[PDB]
Amino acid sequence: PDSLEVLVKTLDSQTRTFIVGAQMNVKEFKEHIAASVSIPSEKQRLIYQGRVLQDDKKLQEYNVGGKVIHLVER
Secondary structure: OOEEEEEEEEOOOOEEEEEEEOOOEHHHHHHHHHHHHOOOHHHEEEEEOOEEOOOOOEHHHHOOOOEEEEEEEO
16 A cells, blocks of 8 residues: 554553555654654654664564554653
8 A cells, every 4th residue: 555554652641543655764754743742753762562663664664554653752
């Protein structure tokens, strides 16, 4: 598909659902969600299945479509 559904849960138990271009990278995803989650992109750490997502990698590489990613500040 052309786009990915990505859920983001913060430590305060808020879960938001985003729909983004399927080739979007992690740095760009942080920028996409920053206003919604009220955490500046440079202060975001994203975690999925035990691992910290790296800025230069594509979301798709982590196979997160339809899945929950956790977001922590700093």
